[PDB]
Every structure is written in structure tokens, then in C-alpha cells.
Design a protein around this nucleic acid. Sequence first.
DNA 1: AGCAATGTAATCGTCTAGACGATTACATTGC
Lengths: 50, 358, 358, 227
Amino acid sequence: NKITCTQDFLHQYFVTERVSIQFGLNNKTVKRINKDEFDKAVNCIMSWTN
Amino acid sequence: ALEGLRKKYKTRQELVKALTPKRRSIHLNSCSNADVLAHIKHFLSLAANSLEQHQQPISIVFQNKKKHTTLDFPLNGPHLSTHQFKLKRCAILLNLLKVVMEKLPLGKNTTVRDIFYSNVELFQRQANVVQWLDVIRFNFKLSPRKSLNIIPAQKGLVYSPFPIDIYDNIQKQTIFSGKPCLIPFFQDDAVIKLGNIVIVEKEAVFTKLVNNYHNTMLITGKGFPDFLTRLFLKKLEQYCSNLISDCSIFTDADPYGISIALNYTHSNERNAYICTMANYKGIRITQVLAQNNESIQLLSLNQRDYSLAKNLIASLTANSWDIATSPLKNVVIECQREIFFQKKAEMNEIDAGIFKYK
Amino acid sequence: ATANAGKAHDADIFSVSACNSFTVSCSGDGYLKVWDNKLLDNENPKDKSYSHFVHKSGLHHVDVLQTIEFELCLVATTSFSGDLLFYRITRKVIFEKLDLLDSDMKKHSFWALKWGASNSHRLVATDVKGTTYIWKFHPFNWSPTLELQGTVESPMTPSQFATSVDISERGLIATGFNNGTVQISELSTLRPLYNFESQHSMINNSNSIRSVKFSPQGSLLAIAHDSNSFGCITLYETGERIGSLSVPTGEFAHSSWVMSLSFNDSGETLCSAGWDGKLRFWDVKTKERITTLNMHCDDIEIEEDILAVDEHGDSLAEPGVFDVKFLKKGWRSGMGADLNESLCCVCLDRSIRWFREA
Amino acid sequence: ARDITFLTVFLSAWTSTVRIEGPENSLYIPLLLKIKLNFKMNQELFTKLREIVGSSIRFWEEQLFYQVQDVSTIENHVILSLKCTILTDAQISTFISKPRELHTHAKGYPEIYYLSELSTTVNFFSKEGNYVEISQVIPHFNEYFSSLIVSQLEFEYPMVFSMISRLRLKWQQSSLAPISYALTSNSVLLPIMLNMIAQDKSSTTAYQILCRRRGPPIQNFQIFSLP
DNA sequence: AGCAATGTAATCGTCTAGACGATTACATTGC
Ligand SMILES: [Mg+2]
């Protein structure tokens, strides 16, 4: 099987988000990315540099 | 695996309570040896087979002293509280429930101290055993004192110049004349026979009177009196009041002595068995400053000696109004006097003939 | 020398005050017993006891305030649980309890109390821990109000009992303590000018401070303490020692603690109230005894008004004195009202006896 | 030879792997446990990455209660030799091995499997290419090695990568033998109770955020913190 | 040493989701 995301479950349910100082589990920088869009993006990145 | 727990249940609540392991909440309750034996065996067997075959997380639930606590086995409370070492209370409960099994059929009572010393590395304290005994005693509608063959350890000690004779239909024990021994143990039925009362504390002044001994009997529970000493005093009074006379507690001037004396004198509104002869002729602060006209005896009050002295002023004067006439008038006035004077006396160093009439 | 108000209260009188109209005196049995100052020729003050129940815990301190320049008079009193209980005594007599403090602040046990007259009326009161608050009166349609303006924290750690206090004219809040260290502050600065201590350089003991009184001018400062079995008074001129008033035999002024003392109107005499029962009058120049007022319970043959036996059975032929006060000229009424200056006293046998010499 | 390889969650594109040495109601137990973190990136980059990897000793020693031994690099990897502090060989024997052979009958005991290797294959794709930026990968070393713990490694292996479950086990393992010794005058129920403690779901991180939350400061989860 | 009380710490209800605050809990005084 595959893992979810720590924030996907954290955002599907209604958590008041103030657990950043307590649980430290809220990192806003990046989220779950679909495999197809990520693959096409990295392919484009490699193709640009050549 | 979340594939089946996240995409099918879609609620913040209604999930932490539904997808919770099936707990078999078991009640401790369901006046004879066979009845309690059978009920405790049923508890033990129903817990054991549930753990073994069905694999059921047990949830022990019981009642506590009325002014509810549930001891779940795999600490399955979804709230990791810092104060959560709850399996050391459950393993003492289930261990005492085994000693009860091992001691009931023999019909010979065993003290709390022996039970503690059998498994000291587990119970870790003789107070814990008593605390958990006074819970399974209540949850079984049994008297805390007349109970499932577990007895106190005879703290209180009595000096008497005449052989008193207890009579318990457990057969009779016998306190002997002139031998500072412990008060004999007996159940709540004995007809005490004689063949005056001066109660003390700390065992130090008591030992001094035993050494001196210049017909006065010297009952003395060592700190704050135990149940055995209070039962001894009560039954002694109610069976030989026409012999004995002038019961007198003797404590020092600290706002602790005034509580040790209060233990003999009167308990709360639920005060079943207390010695009612407690004419508290204690060593007051106006009795030391009068003999101080023959390391100072007078010690200034700290923040514990006083905080507890003004707590017997707020407590005593709660329902009764008239201070002019009351059995606690003497206690209240002496309690206010220490707070005003800021200095408490002692009885260890000021021993004299005041204890006797002459 | 004046009509003794024997058997005033029935538990224990603990203080007294004077208001040129009133002679308010708290006691242990909950209620004040204000006595009208002006009699006519012989009327006993017993029928003038205008009692009013205040708090059932008890009372230890009391102080009054008279402003005549329309005739607002107040009476403050602290209880044995710790509470300011201002009572605006109007005029027959009505005891309207006043509430000038919020319940939020009322969390600590106030102990001492003393009023400060306006030259801006001020009142201060020490806590049991050692804190010393300083209020300020704004009576000014009618709403008396007590407003805080400072608090001189006890520098010591751990803190002591904080027995006494003063609000001297020019401003020096001599907060006495349970072992020397008489804190000295300023009424308009709240910055401790000095921090005194017990000049005794003997072994470590508990020499408490019972009273701290100033001079009407504002120069002298009487200090009354005890060497744990005697009474001594040492002046702290504004600690800086001027001398130790005592009597020849050692270094003691009384055979027991000097419980209270007060200055005079001209500041030329220092009356003393000792547990030894005498009232030895000192002087600020000669430092010698003037007169002795021994007390005994044989003034009246009839036993119904005099008290000679305590609650337990001992003989109070040697009554202690908890508080005495001085009355200005034209305060008391009777013979020698203007040519003589009167003083009142409070004894152990619960008998307020106003006094007059020559 | 059953093996489990978690699917590649594209947070950058990386993977995982749990190697087990068992015979095929189960109880998973740490070996005696090496956590491999080979990057497989097609400079000082390896030095700083090893620094971040070794910056998690505070986590492994204050949350999961482990004991690091080596941070050795076998020519490609940043492996961490981890020895369990709670599930020591003495406890591993005492709790389960003795009744598993002493009480030989149709008991129903859980068959204990094992696990040694956790080979992660985090493969970053930097936007600028070969060059990287420091402190930019903390919310990439913290949103994978926390998501994997939250999702499955606390459910299907609650004894080796579970914070609160291991905390409860080390809290209540002292009174685990005398609670059955007083229940059946034996030690038969030790493996069943140890399996039930792992099977408990009310001690995973999923059911711990969603509560009344009486105590804030626990489960820091900010692993691989930059020095 | 068998019983007890003080002090504060932690959690549990209400009332403004956290807080505070007004309540019980058990550790550390004590005789
Ligand atoms: Mg004592």
C-alpha cells in the first residue's frame, strides 16, 4: 500500500492548526503531489537543460 | 494501513469512538466468605478467559469512596496524559485479588504489612495496599474494618497495671500488667474486662512515664491514633464506664497536637466509633508560660504550623454559632491564641507532674 | 481609678481603640463592643456595650478614625481568618458594614492595622507573609473608597510573621516582624530608608517584636521586643540605639513579654503593658520607672462581675495585658477630665478598665 | 520470502522498504535495525546530507527510545545502526520465547516476525539542477519521515516506529508479568497481552491529534533539524 | 508506624475553542 500525507489527514478533518507549537506537524512549504504531474514536470525540467 | 480507514470514514469525530477496540467494561461488584470468594473467582476467571480466548481489552470499573475511576488495561485512553502510569494501580488491584483468593479458604487473617513485604518490589509502599484494600472492601458492601481477613498491624501500644481481658468469638487475648506491649487485636464484638486513662503521643513521653511510674493506665497510639486504639477506647468505655474515670488526652501546643487530640475527641458528622470521654486537658500555651518561672522550648510558628492552625478555626466554626458554650470552645480559643502569640510550646522537654493530679 | 468594665466579652479581648467618642474593642467572640466615652456621673459602661456581631471566626486588631472639621467616623477590624471589616459607626448606634475592597484582592490574611490622620487619610495593614500594603482614603454622592498607593515587600527570604506596623506623621512605616528586622519605609516614596535588625548578638533564637510606636514629633521610635523569656524596650532614634529601658535586680523591663505599649500626647511618657500584669511607665529622658500598676481580681467582693478562673480551671490572679491605649485631653468624661489625660487597658480576664492617675 | 515495499509517494520522488526475517495474529519486533538513506542522485553535498541525517539522534533517542551505534557510510549509504532500548534481547526472550515453548499446546499465540532494514530512496530534483540550498530540505526530510510514521508504520508495525505505543509499552511493561501471575498463577498470557498492546489503536498518532489535548508539549516531530 | 492534612499539580466542567478557574489527586510534608 501507500502512505497518505501528514497534512492530508490533518486537513481532511478540522484541526485548529495551532498544533505547530505542540506537535510540529504543520509544514506549509510542500504538499502531496500527483505522480503524473510530478513526472511530467521533472521531465520538462530535464528537457529544458539538455 | 489507511486504505480503508481514511477513504470510508470521513469524520473527525464518529471515528475515534467507533474505530476503538471493543472494551468489555467489567464492574468489581458482581457479607459471607463463600459469597465474596465466588464473586472474586468469577471476576478473575472472566478476566482471564476474556484475555486468553476472545482477546478482549478489559476495562475495570468500580466505585470509590463517596465525598468514577476506570482502569483500562492497555492504557487505551486516546489522550496521552503525562500523569498516566495507570498499570501499576491495576497490577496491585489484580494482585491483591489473588492474595484474597489464597487467604480466604484458610480462614486465617493476614496483616497488610506481611502482604506488602511478600511483594515489596511490586507494591512499593504499604499505603498503596491499604488504599486499594479500602476500595475493594467498599465495592463489596463490606465493612472496612470487619472485612475479608486482612487486619491492621498493631501500631498502638498500651501500658496497664491490671490484666485487661478481651473476649472475641473469633478464645481470649490478655493485656498484661506492667509490660508496655502493643494493644491486642480483636474484632468489633469483644466484651472487654478489667482485671485513670492518660493518652499521650510520640511514644517518647509515654516511654518516660513507663520509666518513672511514680491506678492510671497509659493507652497511647503513637502519632495520629489508629482504628484499633479508637475501638479499644470506645469498647473500654462502653463496657467499663462505671470503673474508669477522667480520660485525659495529653498533646503539646503545636497545631498538630490539637488535631491528634481531635482524632480521639470527635470526627466529622459521620462519626460512628469515637471515644466520647476525651476531656482534652492538653499542654496549652498558657500552661507553659505559667511554669516558665521556675534551646528554648517556645518555637516560632512556621507556615505549616500556622496554616493548619487557622484551618481548625475555619473548620470548627462552620455550623455551631455560640462560642460562649460549646465543647469545641476550648479548642477554638487555644487555636486562636497560638496564631496571635506566634509561638508554640513543646511537651517532650517540659515533662512534669502535671500529667497526674498530684 | 475609673469604672472597670469587667466580664465585657466571654471568649478573650485582644485589643482596644479610642475615638474621643468611642472606645471600640474587638475580641475573640466575634463582635465589637464600642463604649461611649462620655458618661454623666457614675453610669457603668456595661449597659453602654453596643455590641454588633461581625465575624464568627474572631477578632484581634482594631483601629478607628475621627474627622471633625460632616462627622464621618470609621472603625476597622481584622479577623482571625484575615479580613478587613470597616464599620462606619454612625449615631441610636447603627453598624453599617462597608465594603471598600474588591473580592479579587481579598485572598490573603491581613494581620496588623493602623490609621493615619490627614495633615489625606491613610491606612496600612501587614499580611501574614510579610507584605505591607498602603491605602489612601477618598471619602468625598456618598461613597467611601479605599485606594491602594503602594506595597513594601518583605526583603527577607523566607519571610516572617510581620507582627506590627506604624503610619507615623512625617512618614516612616516601621513594619515590625517576628524576629527583629523592623522594616522602615516612606509614605510618599515606598523605598526602604533603612532595614533594621535585632541588636542582640547572642546565640540564634526567636526574639519577636510585639509593638513599634513612634513619637508625636517624629524623631523617636520605641521598639518593644522580648528575649524569649522577658521584656525589653530599646529606642531606635531616626537600628541606631539610644538605650535599653529596664529595671535593676538584668537587661529586662518585665518578667514576661512586653505585649503592647503606646506613646503619649506630648511624647514625654511611654506606658508599658506586660504579661507580668504591671503597667510600668517609662520616660524618654531619665529612662526610669515611674509607677507600677499590679492587677488582681479582688476589687469587688461579689463574684458575678469579676473573673478570676479561666475556662480550664487555673487562677487568673495574674492576668496578661494584650493592648493599652492613650486618650487625648478632653476625651474621657468625669472628674479630672481636662486637667488629666486618661488611658484605657485590656486584660486577660476580659475586663476593660479605663485608668487615670492624679 | 515475503517482503513489503511502500509505494513511492511523490513528495521529492522517493521510496522505502521493510525487510523481514520470519517464517510464513502477529507481533513485529525489532532485530536484536539499520535505517538506510541512500539518495541515488545522478561539492560537500554528501557531507551536509549526512549532517542532516545524523541530526536526528535527538529524535531517535527522545521519542522512539533507540540507541544509535554507527553512522557508517558503506560507499553509497548513510545507514544508522539502531539498537532498541525497550525491546532488548532479554525482554524479547522473557516476554514471549519462554511461554512459546513451555506451554506447548494449541494456544493461539501470535507468530513473531522480524524486520532489519528500512532503505529509503529519497531522490531530490533541484530546480536549478546540481546546486542546492541548505535548510530548504527540512520540510522534505520532515514531511516524509513523519507522513510514513503517521500513515502505516504506526499501524502495521506499532513496535518499531511508533512513538506513543512504544512509550506506553516502556511505561507499563514493568507490571506486565505480575498482572498475569496474579490472574492465572502462570505467565501464559504474556505473548497475548504484548500482542494486544501492539494491536491497540487508541495510541497511534492518528487518534491522538483528535482528542481533548490536555497536554500540548509532546511529539515534537521536527526531525532532521538543521544544526 | 498506622492514620492524616497541607500544598500544589493535574485534569475536568463551563464559557467564552482555550482558558481559567474553580474543582479533585496523590506526593510530600507531619505526628
Ligand atoms: Mg508535637
